[PDB]
Scaffold this active site. Sequence first.
Site, PDB file in Angstrom:
ATOM      1  N   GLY A   1       0.837  -1.356   0.161  1.00  0.00           N
ATOM      2  CA  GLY A   1       0.029  -0.157   0.031  1.00  0.00           C
ATOM      3  C   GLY A   1       0.903   1.224   0.120  1.00  0.00           C
TER       4      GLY A   1
ATOM      5  N   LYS B   1       3.551   4.120  -1.814  1.00  0.00           N
ATOM      6  CA  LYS B   1       4.039   4.487  -3.100  1.00  0.00           C
ATOM      7  C   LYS B   1       5.500   4.464  -3.160  1.00  0.00           C
ATOM      8  CE  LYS B   1      -0.098   6.915  -3.974  1.00  0.00           C
ATOM      9  NZ  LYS B   1      -0.691   7.604  -5.382  1.00  0.00           N
ATOM     10  N   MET B   2       6.268   4.172  -4.221  1.00  0.00           N
ATOM     11  CA  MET B   2       7.688   4.245  -4.463  1.00  0.00           C
ATOM     12  C   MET B   2       8.012   4.976  -5.703  1.00  0.00           C
ATOM     13  SD  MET B   2      10.020   0.621  -4.894  1.00  0.00           S
ATOM     14  CE  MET B   2      11.624   0.565  -4.754  1.00  0.00           C
ATOM     15  N   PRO B   3       8.921   5.954  -5.450  1.00  0.00           N
ATOM     16  CA  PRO B   3       9.199   6.752  -6.575  1.00  0.00           C
ATOM     17  C   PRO B   3       9.909   5.869  -7.800  1.00  0.00           C
ATOM     18  CG  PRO B   3      10.092   7.865  -4.655  1.00  0.00           C
ATOM     19  CD  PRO B   3       9.451   6.480  -4.171  1.00  0.00           C
ATOM     20  N   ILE B   4       9.542   5.946  -8.966  1.00  0.00           N
ATOM     21  CA  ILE B   4      10.299   5.203 -10.045  1.00  0.00           C
ATOM     22  C   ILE B   4      11.499   5.391 -10.496  1.00  0.00           C
ATOM     23  CG2 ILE B   4       7.731   4.594 -10.700  1.00  0.00           C
ATOM     24  CD1 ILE B   4       7.813   6.418 -13.099  1.00  0.00           C
TER      25      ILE B   4
ATOM     26  N   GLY C   1      15.320   6.384  -8.658  1.00  0.00           N
ATOM     27  CA  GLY C   1      15.981   6.447  -7.563  1.00  0.00           C
ATOM     28  C   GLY C   1      17.410   6.504  -7.746  1.00  0.00           C
TER      29      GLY C   1
ATOM     30  N   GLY D   1      21.051   5.439  -7.533  1.00  0.00           N
ATOM     31  CA  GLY D   1      22.162   4.293  -7.166  1.00  0.00           C
ATOM     32  C   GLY D   1      23.213   4.676  -6.336  1.00  0.00           C
TER      33      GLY D   1
ATOM     34  N   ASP E   1      18.947   4.042  -3.333  1.00  0.00           N
ATOM     35  CA  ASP E   1      19.037   2.715  -3.253  1.00  0.00           C
ATOM     36  C   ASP E   1      20.529   2.446  -2.648  1.00  0.00           C
ATOM     37  OD1 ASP E   1      18.183  -0.038  -4.200  1.00  0.00           O
ATOM     38  OD2 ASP E   1      20.491  -0.163  -4.964  1.00  0.00           O
TER      39      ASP E   1
ATOM     40  N   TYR F   1      27.940  -1.906   0.121  1.00  0.00           N
ATOM     41  CA  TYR F   1      28.497  -0.951  -0.555  1.00  0.00           C
ATOM     42  C   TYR F   1      29.453  -0.129   0.202  1.00  0.00           C
ATOM     43  CZ  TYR F   1      24.585  -2.026  -3.896  1.00  0.00           C
ATOM     44  OH  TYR F   1      23.536  -2.457  -4.493  1.00  0.00           O
TER      45      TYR F   1
ATOM     46  N   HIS G   1      19.552  -9.401  -0.370  1.00  0.00           N
ATOM     47  CA  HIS G   1      20.366  -8.819  -1.506  1.00  0.00           C
ATOM     48  C   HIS G   1      20.593  -9.857  -2.562  1.00  0.00           C
ATOM     49  CE1 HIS G   1      23.779  -5.626  -2.304  1.00  0.00           C
ATOM     50  NE2 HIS G   1      23.205  -6.031  -3.471  1.00  0.00           N
TER      51      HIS G   1
HETATM   52  N1  LIG Z   1      20.713  -5.472  -6.157  1.00  0.00           N
HETATM   53  C1  LIG Z   1      21.936  -5.745  -6.673  1.00  0.00           C
HETATM   54  O1  LIG Z   1      22.380  -6.589  -6.762  1.00  0.00           O
HETATM   55  C2  LIG Z   1      22.447  -4.542  -7.536  1.00  0.00           C
HETATM   56  C3  LIG Z   1      23.547  -4.812  -8.425  1.00  0.00           C
HETATM   57  C4  LIG Z   1      24.034  -3.812  -9.255  1.00  0.00           C
HETATM   58  C5  LIG Z   1      23.604  -2.387  -8.973  1.00  0.00           C
HETATM   59  N2  LIG Z   1      22.672  -2.385  -8.113  1.00  0.00           N
HETATM   60  C6  LIG Z   1      21.960  -0.911  -7.675  1.00  0.00           C
HETATM   61  O2  LIG Z   1      21.869  -0.042  -8.941  1.00  0.00           O
HETATM   62  C7  LIG Z   1      22.345   0.911  -9.274  1.00  0.00           C
HETATM   63  C8  LIG Z   1      22.779   1.322 -10.693  1.00  0.00           C
HETATM   64  O3  LIG Z   1      23.589   0.299 -11.078  1.00  0.00           O
HETATM   65  P1  LIG Z   1      25.251   0.230 -11.326  1.00  0.00           P
HETATM   66  O4  LIG Z   1      25.975   1.164 -10.605  1.00  0.00           O
HETATM   67  O5  LIG Z   1      25.649  -1.312 -11.559  1.00  0.00           O
HETATM   68  O6  LIG Z   1      25.490   0.973 -12.874  1.00  0.00           O
HETATM   69  P2  LIG Z   1      24.753   2.054 -14.001  1.00  0.00           P
HETATM   70  O7  LIG Z   1      23.738   2.973 -13.062  1.00  0.00           O
HETATM   71  O8  LIG Z   1      24.022   1.159 -14.836  1.00  0.00           O
HETATM   72  O9  LIG Z   1      25.935   2.838 -14.596  1.00  0.00           O
HETATM   73  C9  LIG Z   1      26.417   3.853 -13.761  1.00  0.00           C
HETATM   74  C10 LIG Z   1      27.805   4.224 -14.460  1.00  0.00           C
HETATM   75  O10 LIG Z   1      27.202   5.152 -15.637  1.00  0.00           O
HETATM   76  C11 LIG Z   1      28.007   6.534 -15.327  1.00  0.00           C
HETATM   77  N3  LIG Z   1      26.776   7.634 -15.660  1.00  0.00           N
HETATM   78  C12 LIG Z   1      25.764   8.044 -14.776  1.00  0.00           C
HETATM   79  N4  LIG Z   1      25.141   8.640 -15.688  1.00  0.00           N
HETATM   80  C13 LIG Z   1      25.568   8.925 -16.669  1.00  0.00           C
HETATM   81  C14 LIG Z   1      25.343   9.890 -17.607  1.00  0.00           C
HETATM   82  N5  LIG Z   1      24.247  10.568 -17.596  1.00  0.00           N
HETATM   83  N6  LIG Z   1      26.042   9.753 -18.859  1.00  0.00           N
HETATM   84  C15 LIG Z   1      27.038   8.936 -18.937  1.00  0.00           C
HETATM   85  N7  LIG Z   1      27.618   8.036 -17.863  1.00  0.00           N
HETATM   86  C16 LIG Z   1      26.787   7.971 -16.763  1.00  0.00           C
HETATM   87  C17 LIG Z   1      28.382   6.504 -13.882  1.00  0.00           C
HETATM   88  O11 LIG Z   1      29.328   7.374 -13.770  1.00  0.00           O
HETATM   89  P3  LIG Z   1      29.716   8.264 -12.708  1.00  0.00           P
HETATM   90  O12 LIG Z   1      29.091   7.958 -11.457  1.00  0.00           O
HETATM   91  O13 LIG Z   1      31.148   8.455 -12.934  1.00  0.00           O
HETATM   92  O14 LIG Z   1      28.822   9.840 -13.068  1.00  0.00           O
HETATM   93  C18 LIG Z   1      28.702   5.193 -13.834  1.00  0.00           C
HETATM   94  O15 LIG Z   1      30.064   4.863 -14.200  1.00  0.00           O
HETATM   95  C19 LIG Z   1      23.742   0.925  -8.100  1.00  0.00           C
HETATM   96  O16 LIG Z   1      24.701   1.734  -7.737  1.00  0.00           O
HETATM   97  C20 LIG Z   1      23.095  -0.014  -7.428  1.00  0.00           C
HETATM   98  O17 LIG Z   1      22.386   0.919  -6.300  1.00  0.00           O
HETATM   99  C21 LIG Z   1      22.109  -3.397  -7.308  1.00  0.00           C
HETATM  100  O1  LIG Z   2      25.712  -6.789  -5.144  1.00  0.00           O
HETATM  101  C1  LIG Z   2      25.532  -5.515  -5.628  1.00  0.00           C
HETATM  102  O2  LIG Z   2      24.782  -4.895  -5.290  1.00  0.00           O
HETATM  103  C2  LIG Z   2      26.667  -5.450  -6.697  1.00  0.00           C
HETATM  104  C3  LIG Z   2      27.930  -6.095  -6.525  1.00  0.00           C
HETATM  105  N1  LIG Z   2      27.729  -7.015  -7.231  1.00  0.00           N
HETATM  106  N2  LIG Z   2      29.025  -8.012  -7.538  1.00  0.00           N
HETATM  107  C4  LIG Z   2      28.916  -9.139  -8.425  1.00  0.00           C
HETATM  108  C5  LIG Z   2      28.119 -10.029  -7.617  1.00  0.00           C
HETATM  109  N3  LIG Z   2      27.742 -11.312  -8.167  1.00  0.00           N
HETATM  110  C6  LIG Z   2      26.957 -12.047  -7.264  1.00  0.00           C
HETATM  111  C7  LIG Z   2      26.389 -13.359  -7.522  1.00  0.00           C
HETATM  112  C8  LIG Z   2      25.940 -13.886  -6.218  1.00  0.00           C
HETATM  113  C9  LIG Z   2      25.051 -15.195  -6.296  1.00  0.00           C
HETATM  114  F1  LIG Z   2      24.075 -15.015  -5.925  1.00  0.00           F
HETATM  115  F2  LIG Z   2      25.071 -15.780  -7.771  1.00  0.00           F
HETATM  116  F3  LIG Z   2      25.798 -16.471  -5.757  1.00  0.00           F
HETATM  117  C10 LIG Z   2      25.925 -13.429  -4.796  1.00  0.00           C
HETATM  118  C11 LIG Z   2      26.576 -12.304  -4.555  1.00  0.00           C
HETATM  119  C12 LIG Z   2      27.146 -11.648  -5.990  1.00  0.00           C
HETATM  120  S1  LIG Z   2      27.894 -10.182  -5.751  1.00  0.00           S
HETATM  121  C13 LIG Z   2      30.124  -7.779  -6.371  1.00  0.00           C
HETATM  122  O3  LIG Z   2      31.028  -8.663  -6.573  1.00  0.00           O
HETATM  123  C14 LIG Z   2      29.928  -6.788  -5.323  1.00  0.00           C
HETATM  124  C15 LIG Z   2      30.932  -6.421  -4.579  1.00  0.00           C
HETATM  125  C16 LIG Z   2      30.878  -5.483  -3.792  1.00  0.00           C
HETATM  126  C17 LIG Z   2      29.824  -4.691  -3.864  1.00  0.00           C
HETATM  127  C18 LIG Z   2      28.960  -4.869  -4.647  1.00  0.00           C
HETATM  128  C19 LIG Z   2      28.723  -5.877  -5.509  1.00  0.00           C
END
Ligand SMILES: NC(=O)c1ccc[n+]([C@@H]2O[C@H](COP(=O)([O-])OP(=O)(O)OC[C@H]3O[C@@H](n4cnc5c(N)ncnc54)[C@H](OP(=O)(O)O)[C@@H]3O)[C@@H](O)[C@H]2O)c1
Ligand SMILES: O=C(O)Cc1nn(Cc2nc3cc(C(F)(F)F)ccc3s2)c(=O)c2ccccc12
Length: 314
Positions: free
Chosen positions: A8, A10-13, A15, A17, A42, A47, A109
């Site tokens: 219930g 609301k999440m901004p679309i 965010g 990173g 996020d 991190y 995560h």
């Molecule tokens: N749940 C998970 O397992 C997981 C995994 C990966 C990522 N995430 C989350 O997702 C976020 C986004 O993914 P990501 O960090 O992997 O990579 P991304 O957002 O796809 O790429 C970020 C890269 O793009 C560059 N960038 C940003 N805006 C730009 C623009 N307008 N023009 C040109 N280059 C631009 C940034 O440079 P600068 O920063 O140098 O400006 C940085 O090098 C993360 O930071 C994290 O919060 C979650």
């Molecule tokens: O995690 C982030 O947000 C970004 C992220 N990704 N990865 C690549 C990964 N690949 C995985 C695959 C599994 C698996 F589930 F497949 F086993 C489990 C865990 C991971 S970490 C990293 O190694 C990492 C290291 C430090 C901080 C952030 C990250």
Amino acid sequence: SRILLNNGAKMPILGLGTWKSPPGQVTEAVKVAIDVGYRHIDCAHVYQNENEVGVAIQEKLREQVVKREELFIVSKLWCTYHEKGLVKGACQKTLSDLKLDYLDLYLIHWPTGFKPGKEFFPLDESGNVVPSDTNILDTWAAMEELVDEGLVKAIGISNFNHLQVEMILNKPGLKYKPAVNQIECHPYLTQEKLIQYCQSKGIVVTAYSPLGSPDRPWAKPEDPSLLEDPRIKAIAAKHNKTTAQVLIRFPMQRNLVVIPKSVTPERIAENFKVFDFELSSQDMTTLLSYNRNWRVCALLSCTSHKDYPFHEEF
Ligand SMILES: NC(=O)c1ccc[n+]([C@@H]2O[C@H](COP(=O)([O-])OP(=O)(O)OC[C@H]3O[C@@H](n4cnc5c(N)ncnc54)[C@H](OP(=O)(O)O)[C@@H]3O)[C@@H](O)[C@H]2O)c1
Ligand SMILES: O=C(O)Cc1nn(Cc2nc3cc(C(F)(F)F)ccc3s2)c(=O)c2ccccc12
């Protein structure tokens, strides 16, 4: 500009990173981001920058630039804390660093539990990750307790494939359905199957690495760059937008949440300017058509964990 979750709320679309945002630069990055309009950040414990993110959040609340209820703050339970007995502790240390008394959303995560310790990636002498027994159903129950205690408003999952999402949905005694599944998604990994599954179940999808994570520490020269794809550049030019804005708008039009990272103030601001235009319906199919099933976010040392999510088709 927000999407209703199954809790219930609301999440901004859009965010912000914060993965790879250096600790010495992310406080100003989050300050600029909130000043220019972001209301969702996020975060993750893994991190290693939640303290500095939290400084920014706190300063903007103190400054009354925003109210806590207008913010949507997300963090994630790292893999070495899946044990039922460790989850609350891990949540509280995230809350402590972020100087918050609740999170809007808290994710498992990755579906894989690692051995507890202070190393994030405990390996054996041959370089394989050391799993923890733990399964995602007992981890899930522990997440549910964080709701009951008021520490988190919502809970969800990240990097779960559809059989793992289905595991939680068929959990005996399921109290809180997951609200979000946060997964890698971009024109080279469009995830049609898993997104349709999740949406079919009322679970909102967040698109991570929507720009391709060009700063991922393991990028190789050979690797494609979405930002430099001439096809995507042509779509961009047609709308007098940048390639990034196109890559950000694209998941928004699939009813996704998207969390581009930047620590560059000019790019933080540009990346938010995506509410002033639309991709056409045809733009969208064309973009989908670039799928390569090219996944950038994973780790070889974890391929043998019983719960490694990417052996399955989706
Ligand atoms: N749940 C998970 O397992 C997981 C995994 C990966 C990522 N995430 C989350 O997702 C976020 C986004 O993914 P990501 O960090 O992997 O990579 P991304 O957002 O796809 O790429 C970020 C890269 O793009 C560059 N960038 C940003 N805006 C730009 C623009 N307008 N023009 C040109 N280059 C631009 C940034 O440079 P600068 O920063 O140098 O400006 C940085 O090098 C993360 O930071 C994290 O919060 C979650
Ligand atoms: O995690 C982030 O947000 C970004 C992220 N990704 N990865 C690549 C990964 N690949 C995985 C695959 C599994 C698996 F589930 F497949 F086993 C489990 C865990 C991971 S970490 C990293 O190694 C990492 C290291 C430090 C901080 C952030 C990250």
